[PDB]
Design a protein around this ligand. Structure first.
Ligand code: C8E
Ligand code: C8E
Ligand code: CA
Ligand code: CA
Length: 391
């Protein structure tokens, strides 16, 4: 619950990150970097003030963060989407620094936060896919209004993307023209219908860009020998006032089964309307899609078919797991108006080291292969050496 932290929590991390996107076509330029980062995250316990109102204290705390990465590879003079890029000089940054702080005020099962926010929502999610992590600046209010109903409202004025140093306004870009928003006003509601069924409704008013509705329902069927996870997801995006002609729905179904150490998933997604499904500038991923991945399958009219196989190797090699995903998308058009289709495969290998000497170290390798009938084919490698210590 939201006003419930009794102890300070610190997190120290290290990340050595190699990302390489290689276009099949020789005419295009390969992107990426090699970087080393160090970071520290602090979250205070909630402290009892001397004001008690109906047997509950008013509470105060604070949070703060700092993240720092150095580029190690040589300058490719093209954007990678990992580290900042100076577009004028055409230079990848040689290093970048993020920091933030947050004021907290709590009462009973409510927590008001002002400053840096780590959001885990539609539009504003966790983005840990590259080097440093996206955060947000604004005010929000969270409450466990009952055993079954959780609510949260907020106004988010600024975003600091994963590859940038500063907090800036949200924006949307089309046809090489950029417009900014004064803010995102949102509500998110999470209802536990039964032990096996829950739902989420979200509404986001991204001022002067677009308004977004999301309904998510998730059911978990537990059996003696397997567990089946069913998800239905509905998104609706429409422009706020005018400027863009955003007109899109994204409907999705995912079914995932865990048996002993195996995982198998199938999904389907469809985009409907007169536009592609929109994402804000600055690579903000939509993590509540059934399968957020490298390319997204969110193009206008696009239907996609998703398959997933996973093995957790704890019985042969502890700390090792692997996951393979394959998506095919069709019924969208290229820019020339020609019928298009595309595929994306992912391979994800995780190894957490088990020797006590090496506690908190892990390795991760990610392989992406994208292909498209009209467009640019590529292969991407991502290799991470991670260290995490929690105290
Ligand atoms: C196959 C395409 C269907 C599209 C229709 C959308 C609705 C899907 O909602 C899934 C909800 O399933 C929950 C079933 O209720 C069981 C309640 O819990 C059982 C024991 O507590
Ligand atoms: C196997 O069935 C598990 C279904 O899980 C609940 C999801 O709801 C499915 C709704 O079915 C649509 C037509 O009745
Ligand atoms: Ca190449
Ligand atoms: Ca191609």
């Amino acid at each position: 619950n939201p006003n419930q932290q009794t102890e300070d929590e610190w997190k120290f991390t290290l990340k050595n990150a190699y990302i390489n996107r290689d276009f099949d076509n020789d005419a295009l330029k390969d992107t990426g970097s090699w970087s080393q980062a160090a970071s520290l995250f602090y979250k205070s316990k909630m402290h009892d003030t001397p004001l008690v109102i109906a047997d509950k204290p008013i509470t105060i705390g604070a949070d703060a963060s700092v993240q720092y990465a150095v580029r190690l590879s040589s300058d490719k003079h093209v954007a990678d989407t990992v580290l900042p890029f100076n577009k004028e000089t055409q230079s990848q940054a040689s290093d970048y620094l993020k920091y933030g702080a947050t004021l907290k005020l709590g009462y009973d099962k409510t927590l008001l936060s002002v400053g840096e926010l780590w959001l885990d929502l539609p539009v504003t999610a966790v983005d840990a896919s590259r080097q440093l992590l996206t955060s947000y600046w604004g005010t929000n209010l969270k409450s466990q209004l009952s055993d079954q109903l959780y609510a949260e409202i907020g106004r988010v004025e600024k975003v600091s993307p994963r590859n940038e140093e500063d907090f800036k306004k949200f924006s949307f870009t089309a046809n090489g023209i950029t417009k900014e928003s004064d803010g995102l006003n949102y509500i998110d509601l999470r209802y536990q219908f039964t032990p096996s069924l829950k739902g989420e409704y979200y509404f986001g008013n991204l001022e002067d860009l677009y308004n977004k509705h999301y309904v998510g329902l998730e059911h978990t069927w537990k059996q003696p020998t397997f567990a089946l996870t069913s998800k239905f997801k509905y998104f609706n995006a429409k422009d706020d006032g005018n400027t863009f002609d955003i007109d899109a729905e994204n409907i999705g179904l995912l079914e995932t089964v865990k048996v002993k150490n195996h995982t198998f998933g199938l999904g389907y997604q469809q985009i409907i309307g007169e536009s592609a499904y929109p994402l804000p500038d600055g690579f903000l991923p939509e993590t509540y899609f059934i399968n957020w991945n490298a390319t997204g399958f969110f193009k206008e009219d696009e239907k996609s078919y998703h398959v997933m196989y996973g093995y957790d190797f704890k019985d042969y090699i502890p700390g090792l797991n692997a996951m393979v995903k394959y998506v095919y998308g069709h019924d969208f058009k290229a820019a020339n108006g020609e019928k298009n289709h595309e595929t994306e495969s992912n391979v994800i290998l995780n190894y957490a080291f088990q020797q006590p000497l090496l506690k908190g170290f892990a390795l991760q390798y990610i392989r992406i292969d994208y292909n498209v009938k009209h467009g640019n084919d590529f292969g991407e490698d991502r290799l991470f050496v991670n260290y995490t210590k929690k105290f």
